[PDB]
Amino acid sequence: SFLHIGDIASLYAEGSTNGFISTLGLVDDRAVVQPEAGDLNNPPKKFRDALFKLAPMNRYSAQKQFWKAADAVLLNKLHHAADLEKKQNETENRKLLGTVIQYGNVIQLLHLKSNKYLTVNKRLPALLEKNAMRVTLDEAGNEGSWFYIQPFYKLRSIGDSVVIGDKVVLNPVNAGQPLHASSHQLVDNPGANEVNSVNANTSWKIVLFMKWSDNKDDILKGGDVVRLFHAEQEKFLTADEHRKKQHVFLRTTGSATSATSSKALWEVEVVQHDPARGGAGYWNSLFRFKHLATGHYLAAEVDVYSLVSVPEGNDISSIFELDPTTLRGGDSLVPRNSYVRLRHLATNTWVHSTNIPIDKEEEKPVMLKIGTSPLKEEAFAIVPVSPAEVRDLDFANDASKVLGSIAGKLEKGTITQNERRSVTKLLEDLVYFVTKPNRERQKLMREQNILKQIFKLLQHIARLAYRVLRHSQQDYRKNQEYIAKQ
Numbered sequence: 001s002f003l004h005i006g007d008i009a010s011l012y013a014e015g016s017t018n019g020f021i022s023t024l025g026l027v028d029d030r031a032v033v034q035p036e037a038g039d040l041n042n043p044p045k046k047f048r049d050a051l052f053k054l055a056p057m058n059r060y061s062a063q064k065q066f067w068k069a070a071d072a073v074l075l076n077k078l079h080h081a082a083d084l085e086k087k088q089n090e091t092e093n094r095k096l097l098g099t100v101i102q103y104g105n106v107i108q109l110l111h112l113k114s115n116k117y118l119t120v121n122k123r124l125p126a127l128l129e130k131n132a133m134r135v136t137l138d139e140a141g142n143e144g145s146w147f148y149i150q151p152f153y154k155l156r157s158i159g160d161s162v163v164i165g166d167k168v169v170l171n172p173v174n175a176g177q178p179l180h181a182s183s184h185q186l187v188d189n190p191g192a193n194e195v196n197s198v199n200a201n202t203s204w205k206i207v208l209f210m211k212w213s214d215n216k217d218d219i220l221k222g223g224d225v226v227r228l229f230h231a232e233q234e235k236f237l238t239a240d241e242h243r244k245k246q247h248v249f250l251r252t253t254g255s256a257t258s259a260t261s262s263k264a265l266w267e268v269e270v271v272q273h274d275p276a277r278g279g280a281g282y283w284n285s286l287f288r289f290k291h292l293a294t295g296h297y298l299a300a301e302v303d304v305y306s307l308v309s310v311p312e313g314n315d316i317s318s319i320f321e322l323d324p325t326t327l328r329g330g331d332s333l334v335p336r337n338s339y340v341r342l343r344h345l346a347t348n349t350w351v352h353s354t355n356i357p358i359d360k361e362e363e364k365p366v367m368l369k370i371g372t373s374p375l376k377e378e379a380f381a382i383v384p385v386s387p388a389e390v391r392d393l394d395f396a397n398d399a400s401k402v403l404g405s406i407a408g409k410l411e412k413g414t415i416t417q418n419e420r421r422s423v424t425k426l427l428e429d430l431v432y433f434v435t436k437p438n439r440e441r442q443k444l445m446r447e448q449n450i451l452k453q454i455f456k457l458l459q460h461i462a463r464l465a466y467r468v469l470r471h472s473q474q475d476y477r478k479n480q481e482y483i484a485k486q
Contacts, residue, residue, distance in 0.1 A: 003162040006097040006212030007366050008112065008223075010276060012040060012205040013181035014167060017193055020050040020207075024189055025113055025398040026391065027426060029136045030127070030357050032192035040207070043276045045295055048223060048267065049113050057106040058089045060142050073321060098212045104158040106146050106173060114255045115391060117141030120197045121176040128184040132198035133175050146173040151427065152203040168205040178202065184348040188266065191267050207276050214280035218381060220334040224268045225292060225390050228381040229256055235368070237380070238264035239291045239298075242367060246309040247358055249367040257383060259440065261447060262393050265292040265385060266331075271319060281404020282332040286345065287320050288313050292390075300344045300372050307370040315482035320344040320435075325379050339379045344372050349356045353378065361456055392441065395433065396448035402426055415433060427464035434471045445472045446482055455486055 003009070012019050019033040023045065023054055038044030062085035066078040101107060109118040116137035121144050126132035138145065149162060150169040162168065170179040180200040186192045214221060228237035235250040240263045251264070270279055271286035281287065289298040290313060297313040298320070300306065321343040322334060334340075342351035348371035357365035406423045409415065415423075430450070434441050445451050451472060454465050473479040 001164040002165060003101045003206055004212045005054055005101060006055055006215065007054050007097050008051050008209040008215060009054060010207045010209060011052060012207050014203050014205055015201060017181040017183055020044060021195055022049045023111060023114060023137060024192065025400045026395040027402055031118060031135050031137065031195040032186065033195055034191045035193065037191060041275065051112045053110040053112055054101065055108040055110050056093045057146055058108060058141060059085050101149060101162045101163055103149060103151050103156060104162045105149055108141060108145050108148050111137055113394065116222055117145040119144045120172040120175040126194060126196035128194040129182045129196050129198060132180065132196040133177060135196050143174055144172065147171060148173060164206060164208045167205045170204055195256060202371040207274065209278050218336050219338055220268060220281040220338065221348050222268065222270045226266050226268055227260065227264055227385060228266060229381040230353055231379045231381060236260050236264040237370065239294065239296065242358060246294065247367065248298060248307040248309050248370060249358055250353060250370055252366040252368060256381060262293045267292050281334040282333060283322065283324060283334060287322060288318050300347055305347055305349055305372040316346045321345055336384045338382050340382060341379050347372065349374050354414060392444060396444040396450060399430060400449045400453055401425055403457050407453060407456040424461060424464065427468060430468050437474045440477055442472055442476045446479055451483065
């Protein structure tokens with residue numbers, strides 16, 4: 001089993017500091033390792049943040065020129081040169097999908113969640129470790145994104161194919177100090193340890209999530225974020241807190257691809273013997289659905305049985321089989337946008353809609369119970385949600401945490417310098433985010449509590465804050481009516 005350009009994998013630091021490289025979100029650009037967060041047998045709950053796609057060595061020559069030049073006609077020439085170079089990479093790298101990576105090849109590491117390249121900077125010192133260079137996530141990447149993939153043990157050599165599970169050294173082409181998992185811990189995030197660049201003996205185990213072969217856009221696969229649309233009820237399956245506990249329900253309305261809240265998003269896991277695996281869903285596959293907003297798992301438990309939200313995904317009671325509504329003469333793969341019914345594997349029962357509200361005393365109930373039946377004699381659409389759409393949500397959520405944190409420390413008193421810069425850039429990024437502006441992102445401003453946090457912070461940053469608020473309500477009346485009601 002070999003490593004392929006296009007494979008999605010997690011990298012597991014071994015040695016003195018054991019753990020998977022993950023990140024601290026979408027706003028913060030540091031790479032960390034959380035030793036107590038999860039190991040090979042028991043990967044971290046937030047595992048989607050651990051996945052990297054193996055990519056080829058991008059061309060940065062034309063882009064380096066433009067960045068460096070940041071006449072006027074000169075900019076056009078250089079920008080067109082850079083555009084053509086970014087297109088070259090998309091084209092050439094595509095022809096490299098599914099080729100075997102050989103030891104000594106130069107590779108890049110695209111962090112899936114944030115869509116950024118892990119990148120060393122020769123010219124910048126690590127934030128924490130004494131004599132080490134700095135390692136960040138960069139959207140476009142650059143020459144600092146190039147790693148030689150080298151064998152940690154004499155068991156394999158330069159020129160050899162890289163085997164899945166091999167422990168490798170990831171050595172920058174220019175800084176030339178291997179990637180390193182430090183014993184240095186972050187103060188702001190006690191769980192995490194700094195990943196930096198220095199002469200050390202860190203080894204990284206390539207742990208295959210998904211083969212390039214399975215990462216097709218027209219099939220349902222491990223990691224896919226989906227909405228579950230009950231066909232005849234015309235309602236999305238959502239989870240949310242009511243009366244200080246979590247509930248699974250169908251949301252009343254008054255819609256098959258209508259917009260909804262994040263509380264209706266689900267990440268599909270396809271059960272695998274290996275707990276770090278996922279992969280393409282087949283009809284004869286077993287599935288789990290992790291609620292994206294809370295990390296809770298969909299399940300069925302006695303009340304006969306009703307759909308509920310368990311806090312963890314290691315039990316049998318959270319496993320569902322998918323049952324097709326038609327039959328084809330092709331292969332066993334589940335297509336995207338499939339209409340399915342759900343069979344709860346532990347109880348041999350079928351997911352069923354009801355008319356029993358959860359909010360009893362609450363006039364105008366929007367929470368309908370979903371149960372299961374032993375009897376055979378409906379379907380759900382597995383509505384796919386795009387990675388961009390999920391990133392958007394993750395960014396909004398992280399931006400929400402920062403302003404929350406900083407409003408707390410702002411209420412205590414003085415604001416630190418390396419902290420005041422953090423809060424200001426975010427607002428410039430938020431302006432750039434919310435942009436004739438974008439409707440679906442204006443919603444995220446409100447829904448994910450960016451706006452509520454801006455107002456919190458108010459008690460320069462101020463000018464920038466209002467600029468967000470203004471763009472957040474441009475041609476949007478519901479946001480206008482919200483902003484005023486404070």
